[PDB]
Amino acid sequence: WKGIAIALLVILVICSLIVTSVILLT
Amino acid sequence: NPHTSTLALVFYYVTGFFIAVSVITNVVETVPCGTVPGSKELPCGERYSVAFFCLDTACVMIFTVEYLLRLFAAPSRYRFIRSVMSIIDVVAIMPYYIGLVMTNNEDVSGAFVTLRVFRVFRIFKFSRHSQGLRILGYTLKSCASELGFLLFSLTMAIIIFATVMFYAEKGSSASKFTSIPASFWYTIVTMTTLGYGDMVPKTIAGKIFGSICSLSGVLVIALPVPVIVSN
Amino acid sequence: VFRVFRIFKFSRHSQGLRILGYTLKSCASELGFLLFSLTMAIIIFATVMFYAEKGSSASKFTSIPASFWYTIVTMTTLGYGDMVPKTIAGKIFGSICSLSGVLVIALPVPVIVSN
């Protein structure tokens, strides 16, 4: 139940730092 | 069915979020914030041009990744194309590619806003998430006929009332009623009970017909709404 | 502000207040879909009107959150007169906005009075 919800959040943060990388690559 | 397994759930969830990201950023691309003390105040969109740029790119990417593999597992990869959501996805992800092909290098004013617009249609992709959107789609598939009559009736009304209006409030000092297609704005303002107070009759014969117009509008719009909600 | 929220102590006075609370407790979901539907409708017509009227002599449609005011003025049939479209391609989407709001808001209003 919650372990599914757990797997959810861990994915989005990856998508964040990727764009945060090109933020530095400006 | 997301509830099939857990990875289906996570895929549903994760694609159900970048839609929000992309729509929110398509909004923010307009809000003027950030003083820019050197010049006029820039819209956040072109100020941090690369930031919103790369975020938009990431979202387009994710949506394409989804849509393609969705297309792959389709039994009827043809009927899957004439499916409604397929059209949504393709017309949502295309304006970005055609925007890159038609980048500001190849640009004209009156033809790139019409592709700035279609980014919003990605928001329909919540269809796959909340039933209500789907169920409204269904009930409009059903109630499609009465709406046609609503439309035609409205057309009849608008015409007759705008005409009698114009002919009435033609001869006056500052007649803003200059043309029949200008008296459509007024008539559809009235017949929906809006009343911007921008164009308002000012002779004797204008006021009567504006009034009657208001009632008739309350009427004509009332016809489909019961069947719509009942369905 | 919060010196008014004692007005709800009227709950034990009128049947209607508590009964209305119970009706809302019953309408927990449908109101959520109202929220969602009106949300996306607002957003769509805001964007459309904006790009339709962004370029104009006295464009008051500066930002999208500067057209949310307009789209929810008309989508609810208020019609103040502060922001009016002026291009032959803002008129149309504003007019359509009006009817669209009429239809979208009137989905729950029968379910709520029935409950």
Q: Which domain CATH number covers B64?
A: 1.20.120.350
Residues B31 and B106 grouped into a single domain: yes
Residues B138 and B128 grouped into a single domain: no
Instruction: Please calculate the CA angle B35-B39-B43 and round it to the nearest 5 degrees.
Output: 55
Residues B158 and B118 grouped into a single domain: no
Residues B118 and B152 grouped into a single domain: no
Residue with tokens 């164009």: B199
| Alpha-carbon distance values, B204 to B90, B207, B211 (Å) | 55, 6, 12
Cβ within 8 Å, pair A7-B6? yes
HEC string of chain C equals CCCCHHHHHHHHCCHHHHHHHHHHHHCHHHHHHHHHHHHHHHHHHHHHHHHHHCCCCCCCCCCHHHCHHHHHHHCCCCCCCCCCCCCCCCHHHHHHHHHHHHHHHCCHHHHHHHC
Residues B77 and B93 grouped into a single domain: yes
Separation CA B89–CA B164 (nearest Å): 46
Helix (H, G, I), strand (E, B) or coil at B43: strand
Helix (H, G, I), strand (E, B) or coil at B32: strand
| Alpha-carbon distance values, B131 to B10, B127, C12, C37 (Å) | 19, 7, 38, 11
Separation CA B122–CA B93 (nearest Å): 8
Separation CA B209–CA B190 (nearest Å): 10
**Residue B34: closest CA among B21, B49, B48:** B48
Is B188 within 8 Å of B216 (Cβ atoms)? no
Separation CA B23–CA B217 (nearest Å): 35
Is C95 within 8 Å of C89 (Cβ atoms)? no
The last residue of one of the domains, among B72, B105, B132, is B132
User: Tell me, what CATH number does C32's domain have?
Assistant: 1.10.287.70
- Please tell me whether C94 is known to bind a ligand: no
**Residue C57: closest CA among C87, C13, C82, C102:** C87
Helix boundaries (H) for chain B: 6-28, 44-47, 49-72, 79-82, 84-101, 109-116, 131-142, 144-168, 183-190, 204-222, 224-230
Residue with tokens 């019409």: B114
Is C64 within 8 Å of B30 (Cβ atoms)? yes
Separation CA B33–CA B23 (nearest Å): 18
Is C73 within 8 Å of C81 (Cβ atoms)? no
Separation CA C34–CA B101 (nearest Å): 39
Helix boundaries (H) for chain A: 2-24
Instruction: Please calculate the CA angle C64-C68-C71 and round it to the nearest 5 degrees.
Output: 120
**From the list A8, A18, A19, which residue is nearest B13 (CB)?**
A8
Separation CA C91–CA C18 (nearest Å): 44
Cβ within 8 Å, pair A23-B54? yes
Residue with tokens 């990417």: B61
| Alpha-carbon distance values, B187 to B161, B196, B217, C53 (Å) | 7, 11, 9, 21
- Please tell me whether B193 is known to bind a ligand: yes
Tokens of B69: 């593999």
Tokens of C105: 């808001």
Residues B89 and B128 grouped into a single domain: yes
The last residue of one of the domains, among B71, B104, B132, is B132
Is C41 within 8 Å of C100 (Cβ atoms)? yes
Helix (H, G, I), strand (E, B) or coil at B34: coil
Burial of C51-70, coded b for 16+ CB within 10 Å and e otherwise, reads bbbbeeeeeebebbebbbeb
Query: HSE of B118 in the Cβ direction (CA atoms, 13 Å)?
Result: 17
Residues B123 and B146 grouped into a single domain: no
Total residues found in chain B within this entry: 231
- Quick one: resolution in A? 3.8
The last residue of one of the domains, among B117, B132, B147, is B132
Cβ within 8 Å, pair B192-C77? yes
Cβ within 8 Å, pair C103-B228? yes
Tokens of B154: 């409205």
Residues B145 and B184 grouped into a single domain: yes
Domain carrying residue B82: 1-132
Q: How many domains does chain B fold into?
A: 2
- Please tell me whether C79 is known to bind a ligand: yes
The reply to whether B4 touches chain A by the CB within 8 Å rule is: no
All chains having 3 or more CB pairs closer than 8 angstroms to chain A: B
Separation CA C56–CA C91 (nearest Å): 13
Residues B158 and B105 grouped into a single domain: no
Residues B126 and B137 grouped into a single domain: no
**From the list B126, B195, B221, which residue is nearest C102 (CB)?**
B221
Is C37 within 8 Å of C102 (Cβ atoms)? no
Residues B120 and B194 grouped into a single domain: no
* Nearest CA-CA distance, residue C7 and chain B, Å: 33
Residues B156 and B208 grouped into a single domain: yes
Residue B196 DSSP symbol: -
Separation CA B202–CA A24 (nearest Å): 63
Distance of CA C2 to the CA centre of its chain: 25
